[PDB]
Amino acid sequence: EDTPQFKIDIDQEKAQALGVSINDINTTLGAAWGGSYVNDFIDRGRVK
Amino acid sequence: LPAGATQERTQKVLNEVTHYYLTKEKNNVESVFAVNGFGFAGRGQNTGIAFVSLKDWADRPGEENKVEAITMRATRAFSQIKDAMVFAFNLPATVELGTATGFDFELIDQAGLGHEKLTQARNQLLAEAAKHPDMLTSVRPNGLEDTPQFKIDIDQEKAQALGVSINDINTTLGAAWGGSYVNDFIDRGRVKKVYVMSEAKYRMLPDDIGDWYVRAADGQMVPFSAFSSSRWEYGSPRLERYNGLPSMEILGQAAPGKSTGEAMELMEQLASKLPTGVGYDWTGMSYQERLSGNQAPSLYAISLIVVFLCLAALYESWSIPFSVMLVVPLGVIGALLAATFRGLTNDVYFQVGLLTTIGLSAKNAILIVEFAKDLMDKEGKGLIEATLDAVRMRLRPILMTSLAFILGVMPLVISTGAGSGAQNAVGTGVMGGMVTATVLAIFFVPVFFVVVRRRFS
Amino acid sequence: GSDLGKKLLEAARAGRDDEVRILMANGADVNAADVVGWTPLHLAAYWGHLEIVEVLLKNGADVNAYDTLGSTPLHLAAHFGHLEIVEVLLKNGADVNAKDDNGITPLHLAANRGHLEIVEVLLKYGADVNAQDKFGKTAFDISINNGNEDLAEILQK
Amino acid sequence: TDADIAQVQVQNKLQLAMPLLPQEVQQQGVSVEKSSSSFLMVVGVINTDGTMTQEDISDYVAANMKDAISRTSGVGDVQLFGSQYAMRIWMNPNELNKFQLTPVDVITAIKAQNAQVAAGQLGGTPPVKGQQLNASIIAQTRLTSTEEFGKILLKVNQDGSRVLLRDVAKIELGGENYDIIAEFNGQPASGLGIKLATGANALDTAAAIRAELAKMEPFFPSGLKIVYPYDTTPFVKISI
Amino acid sequence: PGADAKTVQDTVTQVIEQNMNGIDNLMYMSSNSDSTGTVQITLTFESGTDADIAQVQVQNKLQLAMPLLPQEVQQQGVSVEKSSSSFLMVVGVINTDGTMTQEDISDYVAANMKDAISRTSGVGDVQLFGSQYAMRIWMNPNEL
Amino acid sequence: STEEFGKILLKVNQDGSRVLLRDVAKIELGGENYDIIAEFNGQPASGLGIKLATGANALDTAAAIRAELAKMEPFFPSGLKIVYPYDTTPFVKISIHEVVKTLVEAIILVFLVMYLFLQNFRATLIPTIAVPVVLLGTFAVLAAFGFSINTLTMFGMVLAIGLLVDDAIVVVENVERVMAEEGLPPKEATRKSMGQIQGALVGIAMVLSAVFVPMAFFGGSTGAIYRQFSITIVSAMALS
Amino acid sequence: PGADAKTVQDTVTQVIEQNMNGIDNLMYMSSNSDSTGTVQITLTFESG
Numbered sequence A: 001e002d003t004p005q006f007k008i009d010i011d012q013e014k015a016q017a018l019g020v021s022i023n024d025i026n027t028t029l030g031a032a033w034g035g036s037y038v039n040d041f042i043d044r045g046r047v048k
Numbered sequence B: 001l002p003a004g005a006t007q008e009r010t011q012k013v014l015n016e017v018t019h020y021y022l023t024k025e026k027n028n029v030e031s032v033f034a035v036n037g038f039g040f041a042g043r044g045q046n047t048g049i050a051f052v053s054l055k056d057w058a059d060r061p062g063e064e065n066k067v068e069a070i071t072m073r074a075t076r077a078f079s080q081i082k083d084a085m086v087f088a089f090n091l092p093a094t095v096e097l098g099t100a101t102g103f104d105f106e107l108i109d110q111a112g113l114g115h116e117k118l119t120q121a122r123n124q125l126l127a128e129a130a131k132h133p134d135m136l137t138s139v140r141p142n143g144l145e146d147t148p149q150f151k152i153d154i155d156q157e158k159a160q161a162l163g164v165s166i167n168d169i170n171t172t173l174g175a176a177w178g179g180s181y182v183n184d185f186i187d188r189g190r191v192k193k194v195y196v197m198s199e200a201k202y203r204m205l206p207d208d209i210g211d212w213y214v215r216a217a218d219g220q221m222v223p224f225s226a227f228s229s230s231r232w233e234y235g236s237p238r239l240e241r242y243n244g245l246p247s248m249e250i251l252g253q254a255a256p257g258k259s260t261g262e263a264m265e266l267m268e269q270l271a272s273k274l275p276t277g278v279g280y281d282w283t284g285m286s287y288q289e290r291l292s293g294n295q296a297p298s299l300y301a302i303s304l305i306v307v308f309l310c311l312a313a314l315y316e317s318w319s320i321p322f323s324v325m326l327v328v329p330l331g332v333i334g335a336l337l338a339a340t341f342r343g344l345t346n347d348v349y350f351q352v353g354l355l356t357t358i359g360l361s362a363k364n365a366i367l368i369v370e371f372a373k374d375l376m377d378k379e380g381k382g383l384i385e386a387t388l389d390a391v392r393m394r395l396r397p398i399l400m401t402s403l404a405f406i407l408g409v410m411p412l413v414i415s416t417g418a419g420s421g422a423q424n425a426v427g428t429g430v431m432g433g434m435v436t437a438t439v440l441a442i443f444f445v446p447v448f449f450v451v452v453r454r455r456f457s
Numbered sequence C: 001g002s003d004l005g006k007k008l009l010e011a012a013r014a015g016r017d018d019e020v021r022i023l024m025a026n027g028a029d030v031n032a033a034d035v036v037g038w039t040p041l042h043l044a045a046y047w048g049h050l051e052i053v054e055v056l057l058k059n060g061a062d063v064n065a066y067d068t069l070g071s072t073p074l075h076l077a078a079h080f081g082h083l084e085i086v087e088v089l090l091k092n093g094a095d096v097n098a099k100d101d102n103g104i105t106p107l108h109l110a111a112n113r114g115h116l117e118i119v120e121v122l123l124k125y126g127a128d129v130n131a132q133d134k135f136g137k138t139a140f141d142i143s144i145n146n147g148n149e150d151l152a153e154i155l156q157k
Numbered sequence D: 001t002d003a004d005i006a007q008v009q010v011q012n013k014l015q016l017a018m019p020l021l022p023q024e025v026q027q028q029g030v031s032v033e034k035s036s037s038s039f040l041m042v043v044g045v046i047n048t049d050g051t052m053t054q055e056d057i058s059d060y061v062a063a064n065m066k067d068a069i070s071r072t073s074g075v076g077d078v079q080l081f082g083s084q085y086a087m088r089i090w091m092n093p094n095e096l097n098k099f100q101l102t103p104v105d106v107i108t109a110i111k112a113q114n115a116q117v118a119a120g121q122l123g124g125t126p127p128v129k130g131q132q133l134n135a136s137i138i139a140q141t142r143l144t145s146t147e148e149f150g151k152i153l154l155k156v157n158q159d160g161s162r163v164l165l166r167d168v169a170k171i172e173l174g175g176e177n178y179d180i181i182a183e184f185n186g187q188p189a190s191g192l193g194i195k196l197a198t199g200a201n202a203l204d205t206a207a208a209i210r211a212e213l214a215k216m217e218p219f220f221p222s223g224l225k226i227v228y229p230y231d232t233t234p235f236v237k238i239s240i
Numbered sequence E: 001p002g003a004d005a006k007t008v009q010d011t012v013t014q015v016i017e018q019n020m021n022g023i024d025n026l027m028y029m030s031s032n033s034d035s036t037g038t039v040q041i042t043l044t045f046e047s048g049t050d051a052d053i054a055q056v057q058v059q060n061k062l063q064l065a066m067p068l069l070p071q072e073v074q075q076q077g078v079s080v081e082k083s084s085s086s087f088l089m090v091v092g093v094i095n096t097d098g099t100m101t102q103e104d105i106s107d108y109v110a111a112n113m114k115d116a117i118s119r120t121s122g123v124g125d126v127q128l129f130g131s132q133y134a135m136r137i138w139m140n141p142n143e144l
Numbered sequence F: 001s002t003e004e005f006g007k008i009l010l011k012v013n014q015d016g017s018r019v020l021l022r023d024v025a026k027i028e029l030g031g032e033n034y035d036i037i038a039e040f041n042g043q044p045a046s047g048l049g050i051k052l053a054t055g056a057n058a059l060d061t062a063a064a065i066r067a068e069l070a071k072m073e074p075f076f077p078s079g080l081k082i083v084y085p086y087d088t089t090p091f092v093k094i095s096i097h098e099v100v101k102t103l104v105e106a107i108i109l110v111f112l113v114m115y116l117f118l119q120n121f122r123a124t125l126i127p128t129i130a131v132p133v134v135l136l137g138t139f140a141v142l143a144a145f146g147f148s149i150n151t152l153t154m155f156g157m158v159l160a161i162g163l164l165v166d167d168a169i170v171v172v173e174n175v176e177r178v179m180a181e182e183g184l185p186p187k188e189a190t191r192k193s194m195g196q197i198q199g200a201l202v203g204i205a206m207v208l209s210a211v212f213v214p215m216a217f218f219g220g221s222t223g224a225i226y227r228q229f230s231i232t233i234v235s236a237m238a239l240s
Numbered sequence G: 001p002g003a004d005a006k007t008v009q010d011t012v013t014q015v016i017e018q019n020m021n022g023i024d025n026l027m028y029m030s031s032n033s034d035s036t037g038t039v040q041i042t043l044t045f046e047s048g
Ligand SMILES: CCCCCCCCCCCCO[C@@H]1O[C@H](CO)[C@@H](O[C@H]2O[C@H](CO)[C@@H](O)[C@H](O)[C@H]2O)[C@H](O)[C@H]1O
Pocket: B309, B310, B311, B313, B314, F198, F199, F200, F202, F203, F206
């Protein structure tokens, strides 16, 4: 069934006014709250 | 050549090898195809290979002008060469088999021990296997050894201070020293690649590193020396993996007289006493030899059981079949003497040759026993009467077939031309087996029938 | 470059003590260097072959031999945590304040990989704790950057 | 229907869609599989010595067991009841704002200072005449520890003080996700949910899995043990 | 291009090996990552396996793993072939009057010969001993 | 063209002078990489590695390649020469010839040995007809099982010569003996002669089947080789 | 997209066509490259 969800609206004008990239806004929100898989590293000789 | 050797160094060795074959073997060698920078063990500047093409078999008379002889000559001739492991060898019938005495061993890292710890464990297994020359011979690693490599470290703080980005640094280094495939262009209606790379002279020695400049954000040109620091370390120029995990392939063969199965059983014993976290597995011909040898006993059994049952149904007797089946050794002994005498091996042509010799000897025996039994059953003759009457009637046809077939395979035995190895293997064992199978059977088949008919009344 | 010289380099690296001993008897070159400038002592100090390091120094091996980038056997032994070899080298007159072309010392390398015992041995033999590299970085600057609590306390002197 | 051909046909159309999907969805790895929806068996893994946590065991199964089971013939799908470890950079917004940095700057720094660079060779081909030296050039390599990630330099302040990644984030080794958490008879457990490939023999595949597990057991850490909480094949064996 | 054994193994080989799941009748898998920037992963299958079905399954799992490889490797390409190391014959092409280098001959064979030989009745696969021309830019750091 | 690549603009100076790509680099058509230096008797060399297609004739393909290379001869630049350092088809042509030689020589010897004992050309014709009929029949069954003419199949029939030649000799010789010892006409003599051996011949076929058939049920590489001999020998023996 | 028949044939059609050799029961292969950038290489096989 449908559940409550947190709708957030990015005001384009106010972002353009302050001079903040919408890419930086979506990255900051997405990475922080959702998680961002950046690249790979080697843990005891295995790619993770 | 020794690890770290350059392309020019390897070319000089190949030039000497090419010069030898077109000088000392001018009457045999037609061409030498020198491939510098390629090896089946692993490719690199230090490795190369010379593919020698010889003249027609007609122009190379005697065994002294054969690959067997030319190989032995060339090998000894190049053993003098300073700082180079150079030798010649004949190609096998097919690559898809290897050697019957040879094994293929994988040493596996099963607990993320690392490359350096698996080398220590490999060196340990090799050292122990070297203390068993009676069982294992030429037990060596298939891979390459660690070599000196030039570790350069970009100082992140110093790069950020000068205003130089890491993308610009890592691109400049990788592009100049390593090369960089940019994009495609069309040369005469054919799409082809575009590479940017440093002109050889500016990317040879560590001093050339400092001659490369990267522009900062302020616009000043900064040399690599300003924000980099280098040192020498050892690392693998070839890393092997087996079934996902890090591994090291070990080659070797059973010692003269010892079997493959035995040599493998010791390698397993030695491997069980290696550091904790180091596993092993069998690959290639070893994987094949293992799960093919488990079938053999079962196939011999079924074959021998059905032969009995078939003869049992024919003669209507559980006992008489033995008189036929007892002929098997009479054909095998001659094949072995002939192969042994000449110095041949237990190859497939021989093995299939035995089955045809055993087949024809079994055939001769079946008709003698059939004739003998039918005289006793219908004409009511005695054992010895029927047996002597049988061998008399069956003597001529046995001789005609043997006389025709022995002469028929005679050209294959004396053959020394192209594909003589296969011809010899097919011929020698058959002729030898047929002689003994013919001479012995005519006297032994009646002995087998009488003894069996007496023992089981 | 000699025949025995190349075999000693190969033996010293592999750690074949009995082959090294036979080569030391036959008069194999202890100053035998490869293309990068590594002597048998360099190789032995890197791979952690103590018994061979001792045998080479007895046979007049240059303890302060440097490669084409200025690195010495002590640099390697200190960097790869070979305490036993580090002591034997310093005992046999290894320059403890030896700089490579980068200005990096055995102390810098020892500190960088958190080899606490080695750092103490080096400091005992008069390792310049205030020694900087080409970037003006001390062994203390390495410890605080790596965040090594114990090492930072030892170099606090 | 031949499930092999059905898979080939389906993927041929998927590869036309693949480039139109988001870059994040591509990098997670899209999978085409031909298996039964039901589980053949569940291979549980517990630590009797209590030396390893639910998270620690899961990482081992993912890193040392899963891949070889997934490659076994007859194994259509393998579900890890847990998660393989990842380098978790848990950011702090208070500390990021203090140094005037964003998750954008954090991601850029990791990509720059956690790189595996191809830097060519000394005396590489084509070389100059009289070259004696030939050696690979080793530059930046992938980071291996929480420490190495901690000392990633994000920026240097005007006074010359350094801002490292550990100054704006907590850096631990943790699961790619924290969605799956398993238990065997109450105590902490991980394991593999194995689904039978379409048309494959249940008993022959189950036997092949046990054969592969048998090769791993000797190389386990102390306490770690395989348990068999769910298997549909024993019934078939015993019922026949 | 320009990569070492470690760089190739840790970015290419391990990523591909981790994705070689869901493929039928696989016996074992082996790989080599060397300092020439090359990797070769050989998947050996059960005797009697359809080599075409074996190859397409390996190719398919690789395709899904391509976005996880470096752009430099993605750009170059990853080749999935049936390992049948058994040549009918080797045709050599040589220059006797020393007007052409091995590079010049390779481009000629690639452009004018190779495709025609591939089309010849009964020819399975044709490997070129060399490569077609590349537009080589040889940079000078002093000039830059 | 290299000219076009040379004219690529990098930067324009303030004074007005242009920096082209040819000003900071040497631009030529070269190889993708310079790892391998190929030489044929010291001369610069390239080449083609040609594999045989599935179910193709090696002798036809080799001739076809030489026929194509022949048409390319007129367009080759001054100095370019074709060479054949490796070619198996000359060796395979000898293998075929030597086998046909042995099989023909074998039929001749049966003729001579048949005449030596029986001393009538009429009896020498029967095995001269029966043996080739079986050898031809053999090729039909090889094709039916999807086998090819190769070293193993060819030498498989050479090893079977003794078995096929015998079947012919046994039947004719027995009829010649029954006529000599009883004085029966050829028709009635053949009936009695066959009546004595017909049961044994069926029995022999079943025994020889049990010897050679199980040889094909070996698994892996060794099994594949023995399978070539097994099918060839059993087929020839069964037809005989 | 945007490439004429000539550029398409050189960079795509020929690159593909010169790899479509040594296939079982292949009778003939017809292809066309058009101004819309579209390639269509049809391979016809023996009946059966
Ligand atoms: C499943 C595999 C097992 C098969 C093993 C059997 C091997 C072959 C055995 C041959 C049978 C022996 O056959 C012997 O001669 C003939 C036929 O040959 C038989 O005679 C019988 O069959 C012949 C067939 O032509 C008929 O004329 C007649 O109906 C009948 O009398 C004799 O009764 C028997 O003494």
